[PDB]
Amino acid sequence: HEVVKTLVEAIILVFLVMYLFLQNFRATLIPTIAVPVVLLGTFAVLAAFGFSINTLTMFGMVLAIGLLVDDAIVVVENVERVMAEEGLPPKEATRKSMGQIQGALVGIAMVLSAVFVPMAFFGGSTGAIYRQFSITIVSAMALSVLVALILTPALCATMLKPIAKGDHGEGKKGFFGWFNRMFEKSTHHYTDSVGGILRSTGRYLVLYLIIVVGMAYLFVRLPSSFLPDEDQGVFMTMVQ
Amino acid sequence: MPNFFIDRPIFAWVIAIIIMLAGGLAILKLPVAQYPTIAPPAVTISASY
Amino acid sequence: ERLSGNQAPSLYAISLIVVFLCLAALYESWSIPFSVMLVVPLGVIGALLAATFRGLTNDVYFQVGLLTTIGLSAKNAILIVEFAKDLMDKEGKGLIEATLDAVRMRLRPILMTSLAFILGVMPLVISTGAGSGAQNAVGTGVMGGMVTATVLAIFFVPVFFVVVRRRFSRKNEDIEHSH
Ligand SMILES: CCCCCCCCCCCCO[C@@H]1O[C@H](CO)[C@@H](O[C@H]2O[C@H](CO)[C@@H](O)[C@H](O)[C@H]2O)[C@H](O)[C@H]1O
Ligand SMILES: CCCCCCCCCCCCO[C@@H]1O[C@H](CO)[C@@H](O[C@H]2O[C@H](CO)[C@@H](O)[C@H](O)[C@H]2O)[C@H](O)[C@H]1O
Ligand SMILES: CCCCCCCCCCCCO[C@@H]1O[C@H](CO)[C@@H](O[C@H]2O[C@H](CO)[C@@H](O)[C@H](O)[C@H]2O)[C@H](O)[C@H]1O
Numbered sequence: 001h002e003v004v005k006t007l008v009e010a011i012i013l014v015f016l017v018m019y020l021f022l023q024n025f026r027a028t029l030i031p032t033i034a035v036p037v038v039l040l041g042t043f044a045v046l047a048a049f050g051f052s053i054n055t056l057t058m059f060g061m062v063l064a065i066g067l068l069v070d071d072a073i074v075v076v077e078n079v080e081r082v083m084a085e086e087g088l089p090p091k092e093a094t095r096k097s098m099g100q101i102q103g104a105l106v107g108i109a110m111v112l113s114a115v116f117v118p119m120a121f122f123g124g125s126t127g128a129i130y131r132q133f134s135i136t137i138v139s140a141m142a143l144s145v146l147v148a149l150i151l152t153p154a155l156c157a158t159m160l161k162p163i164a165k166g167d168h169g170e171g172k173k174g175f176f177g178w179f180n181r182m183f184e185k186s187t188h189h190y191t192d193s194v195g196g197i198l199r200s201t202g203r204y205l206v207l208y209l210i211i212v213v214g215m216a217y218l219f220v221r222l223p224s225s226f227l228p229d230e231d232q233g234v235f236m237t238m239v240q
Numbered sequence: 241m242p243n244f245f246i247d248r249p250i251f252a253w254v255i256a257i258i259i260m261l262a263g264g265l266a267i268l269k270l271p272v273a274q275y276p277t278i279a280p281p282a283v284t285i286s287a288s289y
Numbered sequence: 290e291r292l293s294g295n296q297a298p299s300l301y302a303i304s305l306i307v308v309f310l311c312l313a314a315l316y317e318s319w320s321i322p323f324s325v326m327l328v329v330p331l332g333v334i335g336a337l338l339a340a341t342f343r344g345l346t347n348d349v350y351f352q353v354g355l356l357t358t359i360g361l362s363a364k365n366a367i368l369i370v371e372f373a374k375d376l377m378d379k380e381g382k383g384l385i386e387a388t389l390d391a392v393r394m395r396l397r398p399i400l401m402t403s404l405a406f407i408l409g410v411m412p413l414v415i416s417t418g419a420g421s422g423a424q425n426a427v428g429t430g431v432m433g434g435m436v437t438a439t440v441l442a443i444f445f446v447p448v449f450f451v452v453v454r455r456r457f458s459r460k461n462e463d464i465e466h467s468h
């Protein structure tokens with residue numbers, strides 16, 4: 001039940017971050033509706049395959065939220081950028097948008113299954129544990145693509161606000177106007193920096209190797225265990 | 241589909257290669273025998289007087 | 290037990306290979322996939338740092354959370370080089386220009402997702418009470434991984450890309466051409 005609470009809480013927090021960026025109740029709602037739709041469907045798939053609701057399937061759900069919300073965001077954000085880059089209306093924009101990412105969403109789900117499936121194949125007792133996650137996360141991702149191909153486009157096209165060519169929320173007054181201005185600015189600052197780094201380089205491959213060796217260092221030092229001991233509110237005392 | 245892959249030979253190879261290693265991995269784990277189970281099963285009751 | 294141990298190397302080995310093959314199909318290239326796969330370490334480092342820091346262990350929860358972090362940063366990198374590549378291919382944009390326009394179109398979506406998810410797992414790293422051992426273990430790995438993945442990727446992926454596009458090209462630019 002505590003994991004369930006975190007799920008709900010996580011969806012609330014997602015709603016808040018969406019708002020910070022989308023700044024419109026109806027828009028933020030899209031990525032927000034998508035999560036529970038996919039999660040609920042995932043339980044149905046778990047039933048279909050004879051899995052139970054357990055600690056591992058539940059954490060699979062939690063971890064899945066990162067993947068799910070990104071699917072919705074990629075879809076919703078890309079449309080936005082389009083309505084900003086062109087002033088094309090909502091229905092026409094999601095079409096052109098979906099036209100240009102939809103291929104990628106599907107391909108990505110494929111490469112991702114390549115990272116989560118292999119773990120369904122661990123051997124022994126170990127294996128049954130990792131398998132709970134693998135199947136939960138893969139199923140959720142598959143459903144997420146489905147939802148991104150069916151629900152999200154429909155939702156963008158009917159619930160999104162027309163953005164006018166060139167508008168970026170700077171016209172707004174109060175926090176958003178301020179936020180939107182800082183980001184637009186900080187963005188030019190981002191590109192300015194990359195533009196610099198791309199004239200350099202060599203040095204950054206060297207920094208990259210630092211990070212790799214460091215990573216390797218920490219890895220071999222981090223002790224390995226299996227599953228944590230939890231305080232389950234009971235215990236026994238043996239007398240011999 | 242052929243027209244699709246005629247222009248995407250790498251995509252074509254990828255599919256072939258994935259199939260091959262799925263099969264290579266299968267070979268490492270497949271049981272070996274002369275025959276699968278072909279005799280019908282039997283149950284025996286034994287008693288003594 | 291004997292029985293035997295460590296299947297990890299072999300299975301993530303094939304995982305890497307399949308990921309490479311999938312990406313090669315996606316990009317119709319044997320070289321470009323490296324520009325995505327090189328992001329993998331960038332999330333791991335933060336995960337290891339945060340776990341080393343809280344005194345955690347390399348356990349089930351650490352591993353799955355890492356795959357998730359890796360998945361996401363992979364996805365981010367894929368959509369970045371997809372955009373650059375298309376720009377260079379559909380439009381005639383030259384290498385650097387396309388990389389910069391790609392990277393700039395992708396900043397926001399990347400940030401929206403990173404923040405939504407790092408906050409989303411906060412309740413987990415902060416957890417006390419029933420099952421907080423599991424909750425803490427899940428959350429902190431992800432949080433650290435996502436932080437480093439996010440900050441490190443938005444600078445490094447553009448690097449991976451141009452460095453890979455050069456090394457594995459064939460005298461035909463890197464202007465700028467069209468169409
Ligand atoms: C944002 C959406 C996605 C997240 C949602 C995930 C929720 C996870 C739920 C896990 C724990 C639920 O556990 C389950 O709950 C229901 C709730 O009554 C129980 O079901 C029981 O209650 C109801 C009546 O009130 C009856 O319909 C049912 O006959 C009875 O068995 C189950 O017997 C129990 O096993
Ligand atoms: C039989 C067992 C094994 C099954 C095979 C494994 C499949 C692995 C595939 C993973 C990636 C597939 O991803 C797919 O790639 C092609 C080719 O670039 C894309 O196709 C799209 O992009 C390319 C290039 O930008 C265009 O030329 C193409 O016209 C367009 O439709 C798809 O939009 C994408 O979804
Ligand atoms: C490119 C996409 C994918 C890239 C792959 C990234 C994944 C990186 C982290 C994977 C986990 C590595 O961590 C490794 O896990 C195995 C078990 O699972 C551990 O294995 C050890 O502990 C377990 C305990 O259950 C024993 O069964 C095992 O025999 C023993 O050697 C290793 O001590 C550890 O080093």
Ligand SMILES: CCCCCCCCCCCC
Nearest residue numbers: 249250253254256257260261
């Ligand atoms: C002319 C095209 C040559 C393509 C080479 C691809 C070879 C892949 C072989 C993989 C074997 C497992």
Ligand SMILES: CCCCCCCCCC
Nearest residue numbers: 241242243244245251255
């Ligand atoms: C022009 C129709 C393209 C058909 C493509 C078929 C794709 C098969 C992927 C396995």
Ligand SMILES: CCCCCCCC
Nearest residue numbers: 306309318319320457
């Ligand atoms: C997995 C190694 C692939 C090597 C690709 C090299 C392409 C030139």
Ligand SMILES: CCCCCCCC
Nearest residue numbers: 253257306309310319
């Ligand atoms: C798994 C082997 C892939 C090799 C591809 C080489 C392309 C030139």
Ligand SMILES: CCCCCC
Nearest residue numbers: 229231418419421422
């Ligand atoms: C493993 C930490 C135990 C505390 C959980 C209540």
